[PDB]
């Protein structure tokens, strides 16, 4: 059976999977779960993913509940021998390391910020606090890009797909003007054909955040 | 060259790596980084890991800055063909899925709670809020254990090592009375010889948290076997 992707394209991790699907030309059935209607809490979805999170992938009997597992699974099944998920161990571990940085550091801080807006309203968020936390993430990624054109080495990998969507999301609020390597990398990522998969959901997130948070991004 | 682990045993992700190192009898050089003295911001360590986090592994030219990459790398290098990081694709993805649950959900909520204690003092923490967030993680893990004997399947995997350290940390505060599958699984993990690598750092974390947060964990909460 073909993979089924439960998604809300406002989610950056969802968009990372949409980018990989477009890049690899994977035939996938999309199923929309409206997060702002709480549809991730529907009984059948909760039974599928008790974390009530998107993306969720069902591929035969395999149920994956994290974008980084989905990216790795789809690359191993549909891009065997490719460069996105390198076969050499040391290169593959470096890609894994940056996927985990996205999960544990960049997305965590991006999510803390956006969730504060949704829960408290923009006017009640300590913007300077989150600017510091997310600027530290920029500084780190700027250092990652010192030696290489891409996040995990000289070529595009799953790590770039994971990071670029969340970065595009934080960039709605905090510009990359002070980080030349990171701004160069982002501009290059935007020139990928597969980057078109990020556009619609980013804009829908922009609109939804501005309405629910009662503010406007700069 | 032998792996070098930069570590503070009070960190649950560090303890997950320490458990794997003991289980596989890997010879590793330990290099202590005291998180509560701010040694992770020393210029040389920041250059090595700009996320200023432990565990950090240096193995030859490879530098890993996340416990879940370290667990996978060490399993592939010293448990080749083993079952901790299974060779069949679907089983391996399930282990990876639960590793990421620990990183994205359980540890995130456990860290939010402990960080608030250190930053604010326990008396100024919204403990009820964090009890709800961490009880929800308990429910999710109970659901996983209702469908499988261990976290990711019928046998011990890297996912159990990653999750048990953070679970034991959360359970210093919040009891597992209402979670029979979690209690049975946790008791089984505590029977492992490798669990010795979790005991000491858990106790040191308990002492440090009580000191810095000016409070006491409820002694009845922690599951002891
Ligand atoms: N680490 C997870 C993060 C998944 C996640 O948090 N998704 C958010 C949207 S960005 C979500 O589904 N929120 C719904 C909820 O938590 O109830 C991954 O990479 O897939
Ligand atoms: N996802 C990372 C989390 C690492 C982490 O946050 N470690 C904490 C200790 S539990 C740390 O080093 N804190 C020091 C700091 O952030 O300055 C992993 O699994 O290794």
Residue numbers in the entry:
A (entry chain BA): 4 to 221
B (entry chain AA): 4 to 228
What's in the article?
Here, we report the first crystal structure of an ecdysteroidogenic regulator encoded by the Halloween gene, noppera-bo (nobo). nobo encodes a member of the epsilon class of cytosolic GSH S-transferases (GST, EC 2.5.1.18; hereafter GSTEs). DmNobo forms a polypeptide homodimer with a canonical GST fold, which has a well-conserved GSH-binding site (G-site) and a hydrophobic substrate-binding pocket (H-site) adjacent to the G-site. Consistent with the requirement of GSH for GST function, a defect in GSH biosynthesis in D. melanogaster also leads to larval lethality, which is partly rescued by the administration of 20E or cholesterol. These data indicate that the nobo family of GSTs is essential for ecdysteroid biosynthesis by regulating cholesterol trafficking and/or metabolism. In general, GSTs catalyze various reactions with an activated glutathione (GSH) molecule in the following three ways: GSH conjugation to a substrate, reduction of a substrate using GSH, and isomerization.
